[PDB]
Amino acid sequence: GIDPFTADKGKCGLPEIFDPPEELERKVWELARLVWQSSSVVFHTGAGISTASGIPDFRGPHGVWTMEERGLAPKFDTTFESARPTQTHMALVQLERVGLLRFLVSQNVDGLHVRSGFPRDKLAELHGNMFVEECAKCKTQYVRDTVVGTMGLKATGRLCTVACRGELRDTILDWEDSLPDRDLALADEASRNADLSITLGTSLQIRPSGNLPLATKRRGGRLVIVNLQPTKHDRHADLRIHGYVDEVMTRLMKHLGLEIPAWDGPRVLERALPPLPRPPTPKLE
Numbered sequence: 580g581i582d583p584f585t586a587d588k589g590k591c592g593l594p595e596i597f598d599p600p601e602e603l604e605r606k607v608w609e610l611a612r613l614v615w616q617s618s619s620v621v622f623h624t625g626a627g628i629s630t631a632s633g634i635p636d637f638r639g640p641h642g643v644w645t646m647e648e649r650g651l652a653p654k655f656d657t658t659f660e661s662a663r664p665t666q667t668h669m670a671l672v673q674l675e676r677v678g679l680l681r682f683l684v685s686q687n688v689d690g691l692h693v694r695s696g697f698p699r700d701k702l703a704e705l706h707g708n709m710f711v712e713e714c715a716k717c718k719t720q721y722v723r724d725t726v727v728g729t730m731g732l733k734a735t736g737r738l739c740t741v742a743c744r745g746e747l748r749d750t751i752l753d754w755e756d757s758l759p760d761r762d763l764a765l766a767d768e769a770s771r772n773a774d775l776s777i778t779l780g781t782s783l784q785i786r787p788s789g790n791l792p793l794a795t796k797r798r799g800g801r802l803v804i805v806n807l808q809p810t811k812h813d814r815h816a817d818l819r820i821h822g823y824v825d826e827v828m829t830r831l832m833k834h835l836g837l838e839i840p841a842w843d844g845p846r847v848l849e850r851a852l853p854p855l856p857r858p859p860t861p862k863l864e
């Protein structure tokens with residue numbers, strides 16, 4: 580249940596850029612330097628961090644919209660339910676736990692940030708979550724083990740169980756639907772206050788999601804864009820890294836002296852913990 584018409588789907592199928600190995604290694608060291616220098620690092624994720632799980636993106640060579648425009652179908656190598664979080668998903672978990680990530684803003688509805696164990700009080704799911712239904716009455720969210728089987732904020736069939744019997748609805752925005760105010764305000768506040776915003780596997784074409792990383796540049800914030808394709812705001816990036824995000828984040832975590840933790844299977848953390856110990860910072864200047 581995903582539209583093909585009145586939706587303007589932006590620029591789809593643009594060519595991939597691969598930074599050569601020596602330029603990729605230098606840029607990821609510079610990204611390391613930037614994380615180390617930064618008080619407040621906000622990460623922005625889109626469908627490119629889930630491609631290495633089997634979930635096709637929207638506008639890449641084999642993206643959903645790209646393939647529809649040529650009369651082909653996207654291909655899933657997994658169900659949403661059987662999808663494992665990527666090395667990128669798990670790198671972001673560890674960065675939050677060691678206190679190097681202040682906030683995570685995601686356009687992804689694939690539910691993997693949440694199932695990765697990422698604290699929900701540091702995550703904005705701007706476009707909703709396949710696995711999350713919300714009570715129309717009391718706004719209580721339920722994180723389910725299977726995808727909520729509707730889209731576009733419709734009644735799911737189930738009712739609220741809060742000590743309510745309220746109508747349960749999906750959280751998946753249709754084209755016409757506004758972003759959730761709570762998530763967008765927190766994403767917006769995190770982004771304005773950030774001194775570093777790193778975008779991972781998003782083409783930044785969708786307002787207001789794809790403009791949030793620009794809000795960081797106000798007050799002299801740094802923007803880094805990791806993406807295989809061009810992005811709407813490449814021009815405003817202090818650093819563009821054209822590589823597989825799993826390679827970039829695996830080399831970055833190596834430079835930061837951080838391990839990428841194991842995924843235990845689907846777990847839900849509501850609230851972030853005080854940060855875990857982290858390695859001491861290199862002398863930079």
Ligand SMILES: Nc1ncnc2c1ncn2[C@@H]1O[C@H](COP(=O)(O)OP(=O)(O)OC[C@H]2O[C@H](O)[C@H](O)[C@@H]2O)[C@@H](O)[C@H]1O
Binds near residue numbers: 706781805
């Ligand atoms: N492994 C990878 N490493 C790096 N970049 C990657 C990888 N795989 C894909 N990419 C890049 O990943 C980028 C992903 O860009 P898009 O496909 O536009 O997805 P969005 O998250 O911005 O979609 C925004 C909304 O639009 C939709 O309608 C929905 O509402 C979405 O929520 C591409 O440029 C790829 O080159």
Ligand SMILES: O=C1Nc2ccccc2C1=O
Binds near residue numbers: 580634637653688689
């Ligand atoms: O990545 C995705 N591809 C899709 C195709 C159909 C419905 C939802 C999605 C996604 O979230």
Ligand SMILES: [Cl-]
Binds near residue numbers: 657658659660726
């Ligand atoms: Cl599925």
Ligand SMILES: [Zn+2]
Binds near residue numbers: 745
């Ligand atoms: Zn309720």
